[PDB]
Amino acid sequence: RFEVKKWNAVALWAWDNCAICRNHIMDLCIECQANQAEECTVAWGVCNHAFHFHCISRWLKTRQVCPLDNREWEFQKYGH
Amino acid sequence: VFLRHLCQFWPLFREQLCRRTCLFYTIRAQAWSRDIAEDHRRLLQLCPRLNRVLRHEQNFADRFLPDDEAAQA
Amino acid sequence: VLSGLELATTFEHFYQHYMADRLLSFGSSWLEGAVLEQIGLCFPNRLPQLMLQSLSTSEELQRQFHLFQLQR
Amino acid sequence: LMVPLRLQAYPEELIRQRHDGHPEYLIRWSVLKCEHILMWLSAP
Amino acid sequence: SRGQRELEFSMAVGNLISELVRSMGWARPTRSIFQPLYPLPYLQPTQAEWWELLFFIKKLDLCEQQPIFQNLWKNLGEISVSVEMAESLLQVLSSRFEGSTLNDLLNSQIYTKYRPLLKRLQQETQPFLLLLRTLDA
Numbered sequence: 101r102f103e104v105k106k107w108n109a110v111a112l113w114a115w116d117n118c119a120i121c122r123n124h125i126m127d128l129c130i131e132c133q134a135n136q137a138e139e140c141t142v143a144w145g146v147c148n149h150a151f152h153f154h155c156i157s158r159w160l161k162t163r164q165v166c167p168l169d170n171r172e173w174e175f176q177k178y179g180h
Numbered sequence: 181v182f183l184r185h186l187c188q189f190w191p192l193f194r195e196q197l198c199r200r201t202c203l204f205y206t207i208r209a210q211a212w213s214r215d216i217a218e219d220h221r222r223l224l225q226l227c228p229r230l231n232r233v234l235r236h237e238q239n240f241a242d243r244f245l246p247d248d249e250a251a252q253a
Numbered sequence: 254v255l256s257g258l259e260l261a262t263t264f265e266h267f268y269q270h271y272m273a274d275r276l277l278s279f280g281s282s283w284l285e286g287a288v289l290e291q292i293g294l295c296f297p298n299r300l301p302q303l304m305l306q307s308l309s310t311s312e313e314l315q316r317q318f319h320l321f322q323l324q325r
Numbered sequence: 326l327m328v329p330l331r332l333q334a335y336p337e338e339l340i341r342q343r344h345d346g347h348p349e350y351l352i353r354w355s356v357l358k359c360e361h362i363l364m365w366l367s368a369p
Numbered sequence: 370s371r372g373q374r375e376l377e378f379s380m381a382v383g384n385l386i387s388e389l390v391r392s393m394g395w396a397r398p399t400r401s402i403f404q405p406l407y408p409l410p411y412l413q414p415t416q417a418e419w420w421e422l423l424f425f426i427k428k429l430d431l432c433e434q435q436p437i438f439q440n441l442w443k444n445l446g447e448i449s450v451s452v453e454m455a456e457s458l459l460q461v462l463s464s465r466f467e468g469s470t471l472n473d474l475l476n477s478q479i480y481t482k483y484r485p486l487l488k489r490l491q492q493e494t495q496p497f498l499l500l501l502r503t504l505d506a
């Protein structure tokens with residue numbers, strides 16, 4: 101017979117517009133959609149989310165984490 | 181109804197009631213401390229008494245004081 | 254020298270595939286963290302750092318589960 | 326002994342003696358700033 | 370009884386409070402009151418309605434109370450009466466009261482839970498209330 105002295109198990113946490121302002125992913129920025137005449141380019145970050153430069157500028161000026169995945173936001177500068 | 185109307189005249193009633201509560205509760209606290217100092221083995225029973233006191237105050241707040249700020253005071 | 258080039262993505266893809274088995278064969282030693290503190294800025298998306306951080310988050314979760322049992 | 330209520334209260338007298346079925350004493354309490362009011366206290 | 374004495378004290382205090390209020394004419398989501406995971410044990414979880422009924426009842430006449438008193442006697446520290454029976458008795462009394470007594474017996478939150486010109490004025494001196502409003506106007 102055999103006996104178990106220790107063990108390790110594994111599992112995955114299995115579960116898309118601009119969630120922060122909820123406008124359509126390719127659409128414009130609601131903050132500036134109130135003040136019609138649309139200047140926010142989309143911003144990408146290492147954590148692989150796409151948000152509006154306006155949204156992110158404000159939010160980051162408030163807090164310094166990615167609002168979607170709890171990591172320090174890093175403006176993606178690869179390929180640029 | 182009358183308690184609410186008195187609560188709707190706020191300063192004097194609030195002040196009097198607050199003083200009375202302070203006095204009553206602090207006398208009670210000194211009494212409990214004096215009882216507790218007698219034997220160390222009573223804190224285990226001391227917990228539910230605090231539970232019931234908090235229960236009674238929460239009930240009073242939920243039934244007789246409309247506004248929040250008064251309740252938190 | 255690979256950083257900032259195109260080859261970064263394929264190198265990182267290949268690196269993940271061995272770091273996986275290495276972490277499951279041995280806990281995250283000093284070696285993996287040191288190699289990463291050397292060559293980290295080469296990996297474009299920072300996947301390996303995230304695997305390493307994942308092991309630590311899991312130990313934290315173990316602590317919380319213990320407390321939750323006590324409360325129940 | 327005057328537990329802080331700024332104000333602090335000092336006892337005055339035992340102006341009567343009267344649930345559990347036991348002695349209940351009405352005791353006055355004169356306030357002093359940094360009018361006395363009566364409270365019904367028990368023996369302990 | 371001591372409970373009967375308690376009921377008497379309630380009756381007296383209620384009469385006094387209603388008289389003072391009406392005569393003088395003056396007439397939320399739960400949260401811990403204490404804050405400025407083990408749950409808050411106190412936060413987690415009618416007799417007053419009944420007492421209201423007993424009171425408005427005893428404001429009626431004695432031989433007029435005897436029927437409802439008999440009904441209860443067949444149906445008093447604890448009267449776990451039915452909502453229907455209390456509502457029925459209340460509706461019946463809704464015709465037997467008069468004037469400001471009628472208004473008050475209809476003015477309570479329990480209601481939300483469940484010669485000729487002189488008669489109109491007694492039922493509602495709100496004509497005099499509007500006269501006051503006009504006089505101010």
Ligand SMILES: [Zn+2]
Binds near residue numbers: 121
């Ligand atoms: Zn947006």
Ligand SMILES: [Zn+2]
Binds near residue numbers: 132133139152155
């Ligand atoms: Zn915008």
Ligand SMILES: [Zn+2]
Binds near residue numbers: 167169
């Ligand atoms: Zn993110």
